[PDB]
């Protein structure tokens, strides 16, 4: 048992944050990839599944579900329909920056992880879905896959032994709902961006009907390290339920906003100041804290002074967890204007299948514009609370929920600021 756990060198999952001495298949070879993987991929998929459930991997991308149960859904007896492994690589949720760094520096560990997953669940091919905004990094992944094919290291007869496994990089076309679990799957199919109804799971009917699965790049990147390294090495970092290292990154108002790893729990003040420069104007200067990126309610100062960055800790703090905007924002800014631009984001990138998220995000964006100009009475701000209660949980996907939560956090914490804004507009009108 530790004092909540904190960062420790040389037990980082990946190296090459930026520009270590080499980049090649030979680069990852000297950095310690593709090492003794033949006996690993010949040992048996139950060993990989038991090793993952032993280490206790938490699903990333705001999942809240374990990877072991999903990849145990993937062990159906093989019909005439193949099994696919699809790696999501979109970065919506402004403040994400997560797998851009991995796919820009170490593509070979993604090749590691997709081959380990495909050999280790009975899958057949890995579709790597990349965002349409990522041309240079996408062709970097292309050149790395060309090098992996040039060594003959993946493909047919993987690792020499008799198993075929192909990887296909499919770009996007610019979307955020393709970043989700299933509109992804239909955007592979050639149809437009549309999520599916849940109780037929992608584990049984997926890409055209393949019993397939979807994985996030952090889970794919940790998936060879869990196999080639020991058990509970990964599980000794944090609590019992969640354990591991996450990319904690800061984009906001600090000195030199940037990206690091850490363990699962951290004092948030030490994370913000003692790893990434320092808060612009001191620790008292901040107005609020957001975790999660953009699909997570805000946190004030008095709450965040004791917040450890665990999943259950933020659920007890009535929020969620994510990446790259685990930040503060200054008292010198209009937090109503920032939240209203986030609601404009949710309006501009959402499909219009479900009537409630469509019309509710319409009301929330027009009402937040009216509150930027302060043009109502407080019954309207509690009506905004009522609609943000009624949107959540009545949708196909989680984008309606992710649009419902920041308005909820604002009405939870900053009631008197909205009262004072609307009172100033009342003084302005008369």
């Amino acid at each position: 048992k530790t004092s909540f756990g904190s960062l420790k060198d040389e037990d980082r999952i990946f190296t090459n944050l930026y520009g270590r001495h080499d980049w090649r298949l030979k680069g990852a070879q000297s950095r310690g990839d593709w090492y003794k993987t033949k006996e690993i991929l010949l040992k048996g998929p139950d060993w990989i599944l038991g090793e993952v459930k032993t280490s206790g991997l938490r699903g990333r991308g705001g999942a809240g579900f374990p990877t072991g149960l999903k990849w145990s859904f993937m062990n159906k007896p093989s019909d005439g329909r193949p099994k696919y492994l699809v790696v999501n690589a979109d970065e919506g949720e402004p403040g994400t920056c997560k797998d851009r760094e991995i796919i820009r520096h170490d593509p070979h560990k993604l090749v590691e992880g997709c081959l380990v997953g495909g050999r280790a669940m009975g899958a057949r091919a890995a579709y790597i879905y990349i965002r349409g905004e990522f041309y240079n990094e996408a062709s970097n992944l292309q050149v790395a896959i060309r090098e992996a094919y040039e060594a003959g290291l993946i493909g047919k007869n993987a690792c020499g032994s008799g198993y075929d496994f192909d990887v296909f990089v499919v770009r996007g076309a610019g979307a955020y709902i393709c970043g989700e679990e299933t509109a992804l799957i239909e955007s592979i199919e050639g149809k437009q961006g549309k999520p599916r109804l849940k109780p037929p799971f992608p584990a049984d009917v997926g890409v055209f009907g393949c019993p397939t699965t979807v994985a996030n790049v952090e889970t794919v990147a940790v998936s060879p390290t869990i196999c080639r390294r020991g058990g509970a090495w990964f599980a000794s970092f944090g609590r019992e339920r969640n354990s591991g290292t996450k990319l904690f990154n800061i984009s906001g108002h600090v000195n030199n906003p940037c990206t690091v790893e850490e363990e699962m729990s951290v004092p948030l003040k030490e994370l913000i100041e003692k790893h990434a420069g320092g808060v612009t104007g001191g620790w008292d200067n901040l107005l609020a804290v957001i975790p999660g990126g953009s699909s997570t309610p805000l946190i004030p100062k008095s709450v965040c002074e004791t917040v450890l960055m665990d999943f259950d800790a933020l659920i007890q703090a009535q929020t969620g967890l994510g990446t790259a905007a685990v930040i503060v924002m200054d008292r010198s800014t209009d937090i109503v204007k920032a939240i209203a631009r986030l609601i404009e984001f949710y309006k501009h990138e959402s499909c219009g299948q479900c009537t409630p998220c469509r019309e509710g995000v319409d009301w929330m964006n027009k009402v937040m514009a009216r509150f930027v100009r302060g043009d109502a009475r407080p019954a309207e701000i509690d009506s905004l609370w009522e609609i943000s209660k009624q949107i959540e949980g009545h949708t196909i996907c989680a984008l309606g929920d992710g649009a419902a939560w920041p308005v909820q956090g604002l009405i939870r914490h900053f009631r008197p600021e909205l009262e004072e804004r609307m009172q100033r507009f009342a003084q302005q009108h008369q």
């Binding site: 219009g352 479900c354 469509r358």
Partner: protein
């Protein structure tokens, strides 16, 4: 012998496995209100009206396309079921124009009937109310796409019975125009059938358009002629 028990309001009934919750409720007599379900087409889930609070779960789930697990208990008259229906009905009636005098489905609407029998009594949403410019689909079917609730039922009917594939969704957010992009006169067989598919007054008959209103008429049995099937 291949039957699963559902407890619709405590009343047990046997259901063939794999079928929907909504057919079980229609077996016992209940009508969960619906806008994007139809008993001839594929089952999309875009209207959100079919919701139901299934017990021992904090999340209200749909019933248009839900498979039936063993031994349910279905509450169609609970508290948050009614709250979800009033919420969704209040969402639908925002970007829908005031045309109920001039709309050609005064007696035969669906928003009107389900807004009475499940909806709220007061409205909100003071600003807004977007408007979509109409098209000219054909001289047989008059078309005002402002009343279109984007329910995706003309699309499924066209693509799965007409086989013509000349209808589509276009856009994102509120801005989802259901229609045809290339200003083509959509002419096929069974295009007269699309004016009864459309549950709101968005696709009406062109020559009939403003000649009656369906409570004044009386309905009378008759047989099809000039076709061999009747």
């Amino acid at each position: 012998s291949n039957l699963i028990e559902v407890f619709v309001d405590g009343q047990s009934v046997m259901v063939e496995p794999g079928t929907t919750v909504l057919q079980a409720c229609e077996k016992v007599g209940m009508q969960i209100p619906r806008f994007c379900y139809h008993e001839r087409l594929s089952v999309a889930g875009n209207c959100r009206m079919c919701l139901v609070e299934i017990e021992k779960a904090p999340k209200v789930v749909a019933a248009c396309a839900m498979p039936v697990m063993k031994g349910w208990n279905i509450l169609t008259n609970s508290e948050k079921t009614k709250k979800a229906r009033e919420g969704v009905m209040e969402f639908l009636l925002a970007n829908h124009p005031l045309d109920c005098p001039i709309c050609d489905q005064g007696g035969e609407c669906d928003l009107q009937d389900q807004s009475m029998m499940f909806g709220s009594d007061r409205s909100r949403f003071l600003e807004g109310k977007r408007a979509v410019e109409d098209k000219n689909i054909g001289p047989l079917v008059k078309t005002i796409m402002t009343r279109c609730i984007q329910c995706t039922r003309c699309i499924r009917f066209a693509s799965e019975i007409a086989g013509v594939d000349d209808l589509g969704t276009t856009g994102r957010g509120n801005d989802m125009q259901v229609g045809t992009y290339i200003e083509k006169m959509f002419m096929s067989e069974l295009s007269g059938n699309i004016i009864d598919i459309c549950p709101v007054g968005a696709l009406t008959s062109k020559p009939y358009a403003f000649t009656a209103r369906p409570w004044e008429t009386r309905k009378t049995e008759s047989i099809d002629v000039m076709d061999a099937v009747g």
